[PDB]
Short mmCIF file of C-alpha atoms and ligand atoms in Angstrom, two decimals:
data_model
loop_
_atom_site.label_atom_id
_atom_site.label_comp_id
_atom_site.label_asym_id
_atom_site.label_seq_id
_atom_site.Cartn_x
_atom_site.Cartn_y
_atom_site.Cartn_z
CA UNK A 1 0.09 -0.01 0.01
CA UNK A 2 2.69 2.40 -1.19
CA UNK A 3 3.66 3.46 -4.54
CA UNK A 4 7.26 4.36 -3.82
CA UNK A 5 9.83 3.89 -1.14
CA UNK A 6 12.64 6.39 -0.67
CA UNK A 7 15.80 5.69 1.43
CA UNK A 8 17.15 8.98 3.09
CA UNK A 9 20.09 9.24 5.19
CA UNK A 10 20.93 12.05 7.68
CA UNK A 11 24.72 12.52 7.95
CA UNK A 12 27.03 15.07 9.41
CA UNK A 13 29.32 15.68 12.30
CA UNK A 14 28.41 14.65 15.81
CA UNK A 15 26.20 17.11 17.80
CA UNK A 16 24.87 18.97 14.71
CA UNK A 17 21.31 17.82 15.51
CA UNK A 18 20.78 14.86 13.12
CA UNK A 19 18.79 12.81 15.82
CA UNK A 20 16.86 15.77 16.86
CA UNK A 21 16.21 16.66 13.19
CA UNK A 22 14.54 13.13 12.64
CA UNK A 23 12.76 13.22 15.97
CA UNK A 24 11.22 16.55 15.20
CA UNK A 25 10.11 15.50 11.61
CA UNK A 26 8.80 11.95 12.79
CA UNK A 27 7.36 12.61 16.14
CA UNK A 28 6.82 16.54 16.38
CA UNK A 29 8.81 16.59 19.50
CA UNK A 30 12.17 17.91 20.91
CA UNK A 31 14.30 16.99 23.77
CA UNK A 32 17.49 18.94 25.20
CA UNK A 33 19.10 15.65 26.55
CA UNK A 34 21.99 14.94 24.21
CA UNK A 35 22.49 11.27 23.84
CA UNK A 36 24.82 10.20 21.09
CA UNK A 37 23.83 7.64 18.58
CA UNK A 38 25.59 4.26 18.41
CA UNK A 39 26.14 3.20 14.92
CA UNK A 40 22.86 3.96 13.04
CA UNK A 41 19.05 3.79 13.52
CA UNK A 42 15.96 4.27 11.20
CA UNK A 43 12.39 5.67 11.43
CA UNK A 44 9.74 5.42 8.81
CA UNK A 45 7.13 7.90 7.69
CA UNK A 46 4.34 8.03 4.90
CA UNK A 47 3.70 11.09 2.72
CA UNK A 48 1.69 11.84 -0.27
CA UNK A 49 2.63 13.74 -3.50
CA UNK A 50 0.49 13.96 -6.55
CA UNK A 51 -1.80 11.07 -5.26
CA UNK A 52 1.33 8.81 -4.72
CA UNK A 53 1.89 7.33 -1.37
CA UNK A 54 5.64 7.24 -0.50
CA UNK A 55 7.14 5.44 2.38
CA UNK A 56 10.27 7.20 3.65
CA UNK A 57 12.87 5.07 5.36
CA UNK A 58 14.90 7.78 7.12
CA UNK A 59 18.30 6.62 8.42
CA UNK A 60 19.98 8.50 11.41
CA UNK A 61 23.70 7.92 11.18
CA UNK A 62 26.28 8.47 13.89
CA UNK A 63 28.58 11.39 13.44
CA UNK A 64 31.61 9.94 15.47
CA UNK A 65 34.42 8.83 13.42
CA UNK A 66 34.45 5.41 15.15
CA UNK A 67 31.22 4.58 13.33
CA UNK A 68 32.23 5.71 9.79
CA UNK A 69 32.78 2.25 8.55
CA UNK A 70 29.34 1.11 9.81
CA UNK A 71 27.46 4.28 8.68
CA UNK A 72 28.97 4.25 5.03
CA UNK A 73 27.94 0.54 4.83
CA UNK A 74 24.27 1.65 5.08
CA UNK A 75 24.69 4.38 2.41
CA UNK A 76 23.78 1.58 -0.28
CA UNK A 77 20.52 2.16 -1.94
CA UNK A 78 20.24 5.81 -0.77
CA UNK A 79 17.92 7.92 -2.74
CA UNK A 80 18.35 10.99 -0.64
CA UNK A 81 20.84 12.64 1.81
CA UNK A 82 20.58 15.37 4.37
CA UNK A 83 24.04 16.65 5.05
CA UNK A 84 23.84 18.67 8.28
CA UNK A 85 26.20 21.15 9.91
CA UNK A 86 25.58 23.37 13.02
CA UNK A 87 25.68 26.97 12.39
CA UNK A 88 27.31 27.50 15.82
CA UNK A 89 30.14 25.00 15.09
CA UNK A 90 32.92 26.07 12.59
CA UNK A 91 34.32 22.34 12.67
CA UNK A 92 31.10 20.83 11.38
CA UNK A 93 30.79 23.32 8.55
CA UNK A 94 34.45 22.67 7.49
CA UNK A 95 33.71 18.95 7.39
CA UNK A 96 30.99 19.38 4.85
CA UNK A 97 33.21 18.89 1.76
CA UNK A 98 34.49 15.45 3.17
CA UNK A 99 30.84 14.43 3.81
CA UNK A 100 29.93 15.33 0.11
CA UNK A 101 32.93 13.20 -1.23
CA UNK A 102 31.82 10.40 1.20
CA UNK A 103 28.22 10.60 -0.37
CA UNK A 104 29.77 10.52 -3.89
CA UNK A 105 32.11 7.53 -2.88
CA UNK A 106 29.72 5.16 -1.11
CA UNK A 107 26.68 6.21 -3.10
CA UNK A 108 28.11 6.55 -6.61
CA UNK A 109 24.70 6.59 -8.26
CA UNK A 110 23.12 10.05 -8.27
CA UNK A 111 21.33 10.51 -5.02
CA UNK A 112 19.81 13.96 -4.21
CA UNK A 113 21.40 15.91 -1.43
CA UNK A 114 20.34 18.86 0.81
CA UNK A 115 22.57 20.89 2.75
CA UNK A 116 21.25 21.89 6.15
CA UNK A 117 22.66 24.45 8.69
CA UNK A 118 20.89 23.51 11.87
CA UNK A 119 20.47 25.43 15.21
CA UNK A 120 19.49 28.74 13.44
CA UNK A 121 17.57 29.59 16.81
CA UNK A 122 20.99 30.09 18.28
CA UNK A 123 21.54 33.55 16.56
CA UNK A 124 23.78 34.92 19.37
CA UNK A 125 26.28 31.97 18.79
CA UNK A 126 26.34 32.00 15.02
CA UNK A 127 29.78 31.60 13.33
CA UNK A 128 28.66 30.52 9.92
CA UNK A 129 26.55 33.20 8.04
CA UNK A 130 23.60 32.21 6.02
CA UNK A 131 25.21 33.41 2.73
CA UNK A 132 28.29 31.45 3.41
CA UNK A 133 26.08 28.27 3.64
CA UNK A 134 24.19 28.87 0.46
CA UNK A 135 27.41 29.65 -1.30
CA UNK A 136 28.65 26.27 -0.31
CA UNK A 137 25.49 24.68 -1.37
CA UNK A 138 25.80 26.37 -4.79
CA UNK A 139 29.43 25.29 -5.07
CA UNK A 140 28.37 21.57 -4.28
CA UNK A 141 25.21 21.76 -6.40
CA UNK A 142 22.89 21.29 -3.30
CA UNK A 143 19.88 22.98 -2.19
CA UNK A 144 20.31 24.77 1.18
CA UNK A 145 18.17 25.30 4.35
CA UNK A 146 18.71 26.81 7.64
CA UNK A 147 16.73 24.89 10.28
CA UNK A 148 15.93 24.43 13.82
CA UNK A 149 14.90 21.19 15.31
CA UNK A 150 14.29 22.83 18.55
CA UNK A 151 12.05 25.61 17.19
CA UNK A 152 10.70 23.39 14.30
CA UNK A 153 11.91 25.56 11.45
CA UNK A 154 12.29 24.29 8.02
CA UNK A 155 12.16 20.64 9.04
CA UNK A 156 9.22 19.69 6.96
CA UNK A 157 10.39 22.06 4.36
CA UNK A 158 13.73 20.26 4.12
CA UNK A 159 12.18 16.77 3.75
CA UNK A 160 9.50 17.81 1.25
CA UNK A 161 12.02 19.42 -0.82
CA UNK A 162 14.05 16.22 -0.82
CA UNK A 163 10.97 14.27 -1.89
CA UNK A 164 10.32 16.83 -4.64
CA UNK A 165 13.89 16.88 -6.23
CA UNK A 166 13.80 12.98 -5.99
CA UNK A 167 10.49 12.88 -7.79
CA UNK A 168 11.69 15.36 -10.43
CA UNK A 169 14.49 12.94 -11.22
CA UNK A 170 13.21 9.44 -12.09
CA UNK A 171 10.62 11.49 -14.17
CA UNK A 172 12.05 11.09 -17.53
CA UNK B 1 45.09 4.26 35.58
CA UNK B 2 42.13 2.98 37.27
CA UNK B 3 41.55 -0.29 35.28
CA UNK B 4 41.22 -2.62 38.22
CA UNK B 5 38.53 -0.56 39.93
CA UNK B 6 36.18 -0.54 36.90
CA UNK B 7 36.97 -4.14 36.01
CA UNK B 8 36.10 -5.10 39.53
CA UNK B 9 33.00 -3.04 39.72
CA UNK B 10 31.69 -4.25 36.31
CA UNK B 11 32.36 -7.88 36.83
CA UNK B 12 30.62 -7.64 40.27
CA UNK B 13 27.66 -5.72 38.66
CA UNK B 14 27.35 -8.62 36.12
CA UNK B 15 27.36 -11.24 38.90
CA UNK B 16 24.74 -9.09 41.04
CA UNK B 17 22.46 -8.64 38.03
CA UNK B 18 22.64 -12.38 37.24
CA UNK B 19 21.73 -13.21 40.80
CA UNK B 20 18.76 -10.82 40.80
CA UNK B 21 17.62 -12.18 37.37
CA UNK B 22 17.71 -15.87 38.45
CA UNK B 23 14.33 -15.40 40.40
CA UNK B 24 12.58 -14.74 36.86
CA UNK B 25 14.30 -17.62 35.00
CA UNK B 26 12.41 -20.78 34.65
CA UNK B 27 8.95 -19.24 35.08
CA UNK B 28 6.29 -21.11 33.20
CA UNK B 29 2.43 -20.54 33.52
CA UNK B 30 0.71 -23.27 31.43
CA UNK B 31 -2.80 -21.68 31.60
CA UNK B 32 -1.83 -18.42 29.94
CA UNK B 33 1.75 -18.20 28.89
CA UNK B 34 4.93 -20.34 29.14
CA UNK B 35 7.78 -17.62 28.96
CA UNK B 36 8.71 -14.13 30.21
CA UNK B 37 9.67 -12.14 27.09
CA UNK B 38 13.37 -11.82 26.18
CA UNK B 39 13.10 -8.07 26.38
CA UNK B 40 11.75 -8.34 30.00
CA UNK B 41 14.83 -10.51 31.02
CA UNK B 42 17.09 -8.19 29.40
CA UNK B 43 15.62 -5.21 31.00
CA UNK B 44 15.65 -6.72 34.46
CA UNK B 45 19.36 -7.55 34.06
CA UNK B 46 20.24 -4.22 32.72
CA UNK B 47 18.34 -2.22 35.50
CA UNK B 48 20.10 -4.19 38.23
CA UNK B 49 23.48 -3.92 36.56
CA UNK B 50 23.11 -0.10 35.86
CA UNK B 51 22.10 0.51 39.34
CA UNK B 52 25.02 -1.39 40.78
CA UNK B 53 27.41 0.64 38.70
CA UNK B 54 25.56 4.04 39.63
CA UNK B 55 25.85 3.31 43.37
CA UNK B 56 29.64 2.29 42.87
CA UNK B 57 30.24 5.57 40.82
CA UNK B 58 31.81 4.24 37.65
CA UNK B 59 29.51 6.07 35.21
CA UNK B 60 32.38 8.29 33.91
CA UNK B 61 34.11 4.87 32.36
CA UNK B 62 31.20 2.69 31.47
CA UNK B 63 28.19 3.54 29.30
CA UNK B 64 25.49 0.98 28.65
CA UNK B 65 23.51 1.41 25.55
CA UNK B 66 20.34 -0.67 25.05
CA UNK B 67 19.54 -1.26 21.43
CA UNK B 68 16.27 -0.16 20.09
CA UNK B 69 14.20 -2.81 18.42
CA UNK B 70 15.52 -1.79 15.00
CA UNK B 71 18.98 -1.70 16.39
CA UNK B 72 18.62 -5.20 17.78
CA UNK B 73 17.39 -6.52 14.59
CA UNK B 74 20.13 -4.78 12.56
CA UNK B 75 23.07 -5.50 14.72
CA UNK B 76 22.34 -8.75 16.50
CA UNK B 77 23.24 -7.11 19.61
CA UNK B 78 20.91 -6.36 22.62
CA UNK B 79 23.06 -4.04 24.43
CA UNK B 80 26.46 -2.54 24.05
CA UNK B 81 28.93 -1.74 26.94
CA UNK B 82 31.41 1.10 26.28
CA UNK B 83 34.57 1.49 28.43
CA UNK B 84 36.18 4.94 28.47
CA UNK B 85 39.91 5.75 29.30
CA UNK B 86 40.89 8.54 31.37
CA UNK B 87 41.82 10.41 28.11
CA UNK B 88 38.04 10.24 27.36
CA UNK B 89 38.49 7.97 24.34
CA UNK B 90 36.97 4.59 23.80
CA UNK B 91 39.04 1.56 24.94
CA UNK B 92 36.59 -1.38 24.47
CA UNK B 93 33.11 -2.17 23.32
CA UNK B 94 31.26 -5.31 24.34
CA UNK B 95 28.28 -6.06 21.81
CA UNK B 96 26.04 -8.45 23.98
CA UNK B 97 23.47 -10.69 22.47
CA UNK B 98 21.44 -12.87 24.98
CA UNK B 99 20.00 -16.32 24.42
CA UNK B 100 17.50 -18.63 26.42
CA UNK B 101 18.13 -22.19 25.58
CA UNK B 102 15.37 -23.36 27.93
CA UNK B 103 10.69 -9.29 13.05
CA UNK B 104 11.67 -5.90 11.30
CA UNK B 105 8.36 -5.05 9.99
CA UNK B 106 9.39 -1.53 8.67
CA UNK B 107 11.64 -2.79 5.88
CA UNK B 108 10.72 -3.79 2.36
CA UNK B 109 12.29 -6.84 0.78
CA UNK B 110 16.04 -6.87 1.22
CA UNK B 111 18.69 -9.60 2.12
CA UNK B 112 18.02 -9.25 5.80
CA UNK B 113 17.36 -13.07 6.34
CA UNK B 114 20.59 -13.29 7.94
CA UNK B 115 20.96 -14.97 11.41
CA UNK B 116 21.46 -13.12 14.68
CA UNK B 117 25.00 -14.54 15.06
CA UNK B 118 26.08 -13.39 11.65
CA UNK B 119 24.61 -9.90 12.13
CA UNK B 120 26.49 -9.68 15.32
CA UNK B 121 29.73 -10.82 13.55
CA UNK B 122 29.25 -8.18 10.78
CA UNK B 123 28.38 -5.48 13.31
CA UNK B 124 31.73 -6.36 15.32
CA UNK B 125 33.74 -6.48 11.92
CA UNK B 126 32.36 -2.95 11.05
CA UNK B 127 33.02 -1.36 14.30
CA UNK B 128 36.69 -2.60 14.39
CA UNK B 129 39.29 -4.46 16.44
CA UNK B 130 38.33 -3.09 19.95
CA UNK B 131 34.65 -4.29 19.65
CA UNK B 132 34.02 -7.76 20.99
CA UNK B 133 30.94 -10.01 20.39
CA UNK B 134 29.70 -11.57 23.63
CA UNK B 135 26.77 -14.17 24.19
CA UNK B 136 25.05 -14.48 27.55
CA UNK B 137 22.86 -17.52 27.83
CA UNK B 138 20.00 -17.29 30.48
CA UNK B 139 19.25 -20.85 31.11
CA UNK B 140 20.55 -24.38 30.00
CA UNK B 141 18.58 -27.61 29.17
CA UNK B 142 18.00 -29.08 32.79
CA UNK B 143 19.20 -25.86 34.41
CA UNK B 144 16.91 -23.05 33.86
CA UNK B 145 18.71 -20.75 36.32
CA UNK B 146 22.14 -21.27 34.96
CA UNK B 147 23.71 -18.17 33.31
CA UNK B 148 26.75 -18.59 31.22
CA UNK B 149 28.82 -16.50 28.78
CA UNK B 150 30.81 -17.11 25.47
CA UNK B 151 33.13 -14.91 23.61
CA UNK B 152 32.22 -14.86 19.76
CA UNK B 153 35.90 -15.61 18.73
CA UNK B 154 35.80 -18.86 20.66
CA UNK B 155 32.73 -19.97 18.87
CA UNK B 156 34.43 -19.07 15.57
CA UNK B 157 37.36 -21.45 16.66
CA UNK B 158 34.89 -24.19 17.36
CA UNK B 159 33.02 -23.99 13.97
CA UNK B 160 36.30 -24.12 12.16
CA UNK B 161 36.37 -27.83 13.03
CA UNK B 162 32.61 -28.43 13.72
CA UNK B 163 30.88 -26.88 10.73
CA UNK B 164 27.51 -25.66 12.13
CA UNK B 165 25.73 -22.41 11.90
CA UNK B 166 26.78 -19.84 14.40
CA UNK B 167 23.33 -19.93 16.49
CA UNK B 168 23.49 -23.84 16.93
CA UNK B 169 27.30 -23.58 17.52
CA UNK B 170 27.08 -21.33 20.46
CA UNK B 171 24.60 -23.81 22.11
CA UNK B 172 26.82 -26.74 21.40
CA UNK B 173 29.74 -24.77 22.83
CA UNK B 174 28.11 -24.18 26.08
CA UNK B 175 27.11 -27.85 26.23
CA UNK B 176 30.51 -29.45 25.30
CA UNK B 177 32.92 -27.09 26.90
CA UNK B 178 33.72 -27.63 30.81
CA UNK B 179 36.76 -25.38 31.03
CA UNK B 180 35.65 -21.92 32.13
CA UNK B 181 37.02 -18.41 32.84
CA UNK B 182 35.55 -15.91 35.39
CA UNK B 183 34.15 -12.69 34.07
CA UNK B 184 36.58 -10.73 36.18
CA UNK B 185 39.72 -12.28 34.56
CA UNK B 186 38.23 -11.78 30.98
CA UNK B 187 37.36 -8.11 31.85
CA UNK B 188 40.94 -7.45 33.06
CA UNK B 189 42.40 -9.15 30.01
CA UNK B 190 40.39 -7.06 27.43
CA UNK B 191 41.31 -3.69 29.21
CA UNK B 192 44.90 -3.51 30.23
CA UNK B 193 45.69 -4.11 26.48
CA UNK B 194 43.27 -5.33 23.89
CA UNK B 195 44.25 -8.97 24.07
CA UNK B 196 41.21 -11.15 24.84
CA UNK B 197 39.92 -11.04 21.27
CA UNK B 198 42.16 -13.92 20.13
CA UNK B 199 43.01 -15.05 23.55
CA UNK B 200 40.04 -16.61 25.42
CA UNK B 201 40.19 -19.74 23.67
CA UNK B 202 38.27 -23.01 24.47
CA UNK B 203 36.50 -21.70 27.69
CA UNK B 204 33.05 -20.40 28.62
CA UNK B 205 32.63 -17.41 30.89
CA UNK B 206 31.53 -18.34 34.37
CA UNK B 207 29.30 -15.64 35.81
N1 GNP C 1 19.34 25.16 19.95
C1 GNP C 1 19.31 23.95 19.36
N2 GNP C 1 19.90 22.98 19.89
C2 GNP C 1 19.69 21.72 19.13
C3 GNP C 1 19.06 21.58 17.94
N3 GNP C 1 19.07 20.38 17.38
C4 GNP C 1 19.48 19.64 18.46
N4 GNP C 1 20.03 20.48 19.41
C5 GNP C 1 20.81 20.02 20.53
O1 GNP C 1 22.17 19.62 20.13
C6 GNP C 1 22.54 18.41 20.91
C7 GNP C 1 22.93 17.35 20.04
O2 GNP C 1 21.65 16.77 19.38
P1 GNP C 1 21.55 15.50 18.60
O3 GNP C 1 20.29 15.35 17.77
O4 GNP C 1 21.90 14.39 19.64
O5 GNP C 1 22.92 15.53 17.59
P2 GNP C 1 23.57 14.20 16.69
O6 GNP C 1 23.86 14.90 15.37
O7 GNP C 1 22.48 13.18 16.72
N5 GNP C 1 24.92 13.66 17.42
P3 GNP C 1 25.67 12.23 17.10
O8 GNP C 1 26.00 12.24 15.59
O9 GNP C 1 26.61 11.87 17.93
O10 GNP C 1 24.47 11.02 17.08
C8 GNP C 1 21.43 18.16 21.90
O11 GNP C 1 21.65 18.78 23.18
C9 GNP C 1 20.18 18.82 21.36
O12 GNP C 1 19.22 19.26 22.23
C10 GNP C 1 18.47 22.83 17.40
O13 GNP C 1 17.80 23.06 16.22
N6 GNP C 1 18.69 24.02 18.18
MG1 MG C 2 22.59 11.01 17.11
#
């Protein structure tokens, strides 16, 4: 009772908000208790586009380098990626290029990517500007969003844009 | 370097949790249901273990992660113990799968008909050299309250000559092996330097 199934992966450095992002999209909730993800996990969610029923299998990956090998082992079959950095963390933004090459390496076939700078509620602690993020997105050929899982800003928009551009491809 | 204190506390916590768990092993109610759920046994054990460790103040060096349902399916592990060094780096991870010895539902058709044993093996391979698979058996044929342990590598050595699938090979290991090693000595050997991986040999873990 679904017309399509899209595999999406949320990747990026530790602490950028990946689990929080998925938790907000899938359960409409948020928690401040940081608990680091071991390995990988997933949730599922059904959406509708042009009368079509789409099952999203959204995988939440671990950002710690110790879990690189396992997380990249689950890239296979990915149709979509959310590459997340933290607008208050310079390191997480610097790592975006590496994350992009990892997407290209372990997911050679063309998967759509959205670049997401999370924690945009934290305006006082911003170190990455919005235009820096969208320029990096333009450089990599990715759509760009600034988001807050805490305040539920541009979460639904990110996932729905991902579904849109996945559906625009495969329509040939 | 406080290796001995955490080693001692964790081994005693395992023994304590096993003693608390023994009350629930062997329960069978014919008029309704003949087993407590595996999750229930796991949760009782983990609660007693974690409380013991908390009362002994080792939470800075040991973290217990209970796998979600999805994670238990994917990894073949029911929980993971992570040991931290004074440099706040990971020294050792124990991926633990429990057995009795007397599923996914959110995945479309893939090649996930692999057994729990092989999924644990693959998980430990993917994590790396300092991750050890460990089986804990709650109950034996004729000894429902007996709790026993086996390291994954020992089972591998046994199947080299015995040619059985992993799941059955663990049971035959705990049924044929009479030599044992106490959990404390194992804990010491895997933490002073990561040696226990290809060291334990033809023993089970006495709890
Ligand atoms: N202000 C703010 N904090 C956020 C936001 N999203 C997550 N956080 C906080 O950032 C911390 C890390 O969140 P978490 O989702 O676990 O990040 P992660 O990417 O999953 N870490 P890991 O890769 O180790 O699993 C938590 O304290 C969480 O509350 C956000 O949009 N705004
Ligand atoms: Mg996480």
